[PDB]
Amino acid sequence: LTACPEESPLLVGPMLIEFNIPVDLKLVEQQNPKVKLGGRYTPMDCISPHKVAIIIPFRNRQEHLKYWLYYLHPILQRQQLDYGIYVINQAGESMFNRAKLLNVGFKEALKDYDYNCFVFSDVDLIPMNDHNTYRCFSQPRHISVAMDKFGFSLPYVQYFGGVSALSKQQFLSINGFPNNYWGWGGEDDDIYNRLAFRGMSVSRPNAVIGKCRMIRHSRDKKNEPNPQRFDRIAHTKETMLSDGLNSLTYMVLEVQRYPLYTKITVDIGTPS
Amino acid sequence: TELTKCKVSHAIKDIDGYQGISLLEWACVLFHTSGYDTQAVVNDNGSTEYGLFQISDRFWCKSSEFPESENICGISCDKLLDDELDDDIACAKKILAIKGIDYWKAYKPMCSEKLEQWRCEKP
Ligand SMILES: O=c1ccn([C@@H]2O[C@H](COP(=O)(O)OP(=O)(O)O)[C@@H](O)[C@H]2O)c(=O)[nH]1
Ligand SMILES: O=c1ccn([C@@H]2O[C@H](COP(=O)(O)OP(=O)(O)O)[C@@H](O)[C@H]2O)c(=O)[nH]1
Ligand SMILES: [Ca+2]
Ligand SMILES: [Mn+2]
């Protein structure tokens, strides 16, 4: 009945993030009894105003997901969020489409709860400071600001990849994300452009509280660099009216509810 | 070999200003182009681009794949996968003189502004 405080008293500041000791989801489930079936958690102490759906683009990244779950469930709880975890699994073996799976995450999370904020997070990024809140702000939020992968530095000011957060309204305003970026690269720069063309800028925690770790990996087969990214990125202004939420089509092959998360396998079609 | 903005900036020194492109624009272009990876190999509709500059075997270098290439730079594409950038740079120079900066597709959309951030801030 009491609104949660603008800042959480549970925060711990910087944390140690290492990827050696193998995790046991069963052990993780135990350490997180408040997390309900489907990966939903709501604060009992207070009322949170942040109804957050965390959306994870996914395909053959189960090991990464264990680590992701192991570190984030405790963090998101400390951040007093009313959250749900969604892993949007791309069915099949053709080209990977990150942005398109995120659009799917948005529509599918909405079927469960009236979330007002959306956090799109890659499966392999863990924040190193719980002060980096997974919620929405006055402007779209870029969350994974200082990745170890980039020397704890932002690779470029126009970078919106990794972990981002948009309110429902901010997301709706740009017709969501593009559905035509297959393979790696450029979908995030396209999204970034979308924000500018709609009068929005990017908000970010500073480079200290924004430190993140990305589990080291090689580029996945079927997600090779998209040769067309550079040309697609230059027509965002016009293509964003035709490619996005309004043109999304996919088929749900299966909905899985596990104690720590909801996983949705979908068929999003092929590069055409 | 995944280099960094500064190593790159230092290694690339001699290409500066050539055809009017600064080191700022090059750091920007190379990041989006190869991630600064000297061993970067990327396929593109039946052809293959190599190294830091992502030089194509379609016209610029000879590769065992398709030997008919005009091999304009007169070098084996494999020599753009090692850590000595002199020949990569020499070839990039030919591309610049013949086709121009727009060979690098990342240039116009990613490197037309906010170049300051691309400077190496270390001596
Ligand atoms: O085969 C794949 C490729 C990508 N991804 C997801 O897509 C995100 C971004 O891809 P990648 O890790 O290559 O991004 P980068 O490291 O280059 O930011 C991943 O973190 C995953 O969440 C996945 O699940 N399977
Ligand atoms: O909250 C969870 C989620 C998963 N699991 C375990 O993790 C495995 C994950 O299998 P995977 O995703 O590879 O199977 P799929 O879902 O694709 O059948 C499950 O079989 C469970 O034994 C668990 O213990 N707790
Ligand atoms: Ca060389
Ligand atoms: Mn990654």
Side-chain angles (χ1 to χ4, degrees), chain B residues 68-91:
Chain B
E68 42 270 274
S69 162
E70 263 70 55
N71 186 195
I72 290 173
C73 292
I75 65 182
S76 177
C77 299
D78 290 327
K79 254 66 183 62
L80 306 153
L81 300 173
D82 67 39
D83 290 24
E84 279 184 54
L85 276 30
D86 304 75
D87 48 12
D88 304 54
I89 295 179
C91 183

Side-chain angles (χ1 to χ4, degrees), chain A residues 149-150 155-158 184 189 192 225 227-231 233-234, chain B residues 2 31-33 42-45 105-106 109-111 113-114 117-118:
Chain A
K149 177 188 176 177
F150 294 120
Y156 60 103
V157 74
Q158 311 96 311
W184 183 99
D189 306 295
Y192 173 84
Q228 313 160 297
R229 68 197 188 278
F230 295 125
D231 197 56
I233 275 163
Chain B
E2 293 187 54
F31 177 78
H32 293 106
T33 292
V42 178
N43 288 311
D44 197 339
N45 305 311
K105 298 172 302 176
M110 307 306 311
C111 308
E113 58 169 350
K114 304 184 175 167
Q117 76 186 312
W118 296 102

